[PDB]
Amino acid sequence: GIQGLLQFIKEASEPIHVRKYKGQVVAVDTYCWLHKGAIACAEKLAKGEPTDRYVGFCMKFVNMLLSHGIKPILVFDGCTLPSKKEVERSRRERRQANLLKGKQLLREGKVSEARECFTRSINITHAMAHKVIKAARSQGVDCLVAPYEADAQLAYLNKAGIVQAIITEDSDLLAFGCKKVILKMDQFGNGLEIDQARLGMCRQLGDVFTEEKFRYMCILSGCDYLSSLRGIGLAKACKVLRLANNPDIVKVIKKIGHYLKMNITVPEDYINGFIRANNTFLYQLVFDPIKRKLIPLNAYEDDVDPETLSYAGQYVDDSIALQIALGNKDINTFEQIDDYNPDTA
DNA sequence: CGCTAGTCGACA
DNA sequence: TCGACTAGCG
Ligand SMILES: [Ba+2]
Ligand SMILES: [Ba+2]
Ligand SMILES: [Ba+2]
Ligand SMILES: [Ba+2]
Incomplete structure (x- = not known):
């Protein structure tokens, strides 16, 4: 976490x-x-x-x-x-x-x-x-x-x-x-x-109490999907976001050395990783219990290509997703192991 | 100050 | 696997 x-x-x-x-x-x-x-x-x-x-x-x-x-x-x-x-x-x-x-x-x-x-x-x-x-x-x-x-x-x-x-x-x-x-x-x-x-x-x-900003901070601070630039923690990550009033997070990140009065060069392996880490927190695949279909956690925005978000999770026939979600399909073998039916009980 | 990366405890 | 707790280093 x-x-x-x-x-x-x-x-x-x-x-x-x-x-x-x-x-x-x-x-x-x-x-x-x-x-x-x-x-x-x-x-x-x-x-x-x-x-x-x-x-x-x-x-x-x-x-x-x-x-x-x-x-x-x-x-x-x-x-x-x-x-x-x-x-x-x-x-x-x-x-x-x-x-x-x-x-x-x-x-x-x-x-x-x-x-x-x-x-x-x-x-x-x-x-x-x-x-x-x-x-x-x-x-x-x-x-x-x-x-x-x-x-x-x-x-x-x-x-x-x-x-x-x-x-x-x-x-x-x-x-x-x-x-x-x-x-x-x-x-x-x-x-x-x-x-x-x-x-x-x-x-x-x-000022970083908004959900979007709060999320950017958490990632900058260092999450599972993306380790932070070493020397950046919650306070510094918070500071940057709490200071730069720019809706363009990409340009903001490339100026991290400026806001922190430090000297860090923003590598390329990180700017891309932040985009992915962010896409993972937003659009990771989940199961909608109601309709019974696989869906992203949040509806896609107008600036996201779903075909490129394989790293957030890969889709499957909603039927397969149903058997996995009910705990009948083994995770590793995709081999049914139980015969449970929520409708009949 | 705050980061970090380090170890250390979680249960009973 | 996580989080809490600390020792040192900007
Ligand atoms: Ba968990
Ligand atoms: Ba987690
Ligand atoms: Ba960190
Ligand atoms: Ba601001």
């Missing part, structure tokens, strides 16, 4: 309880709970031992939400965006490297620091997620697998009014333009809410 984003914007946060959303619909970044629940069984997962502790963990928050008369929508990650296909396979190996230290330290007498490495060799698989889905469906709780990043899917549900808020631990959800976010929510419903309208109560931001 965005390094230190929450701390930068903490002026816009607010302690709340989920009861607040009684009678309403809330989308969940279920992965966050999955990872946390995976912690309790990192050891067992590695040895291939049969563990389901992360399922019960996810259900604890789910049943907490239901007990307060809340309608949860569990959203899950899907395929890996092109353009991060590489940056991700990269983790594949480092996540396997840390799984090596555990095994040696466990056979030395140290079982205390060996375990610290297993938490970092934790691999949240699709099969693990599918288990959680079966549990949720069994309590009548709706589940939705995003075509690509749950971030965009979650953002879409919120902007479309399907859900009134999003429960997540992820910072760069705001960058996708979602209105209400609930961070740090615990088992009992005590969370820390961030409303997009309260961005204006951040002095540090100043």
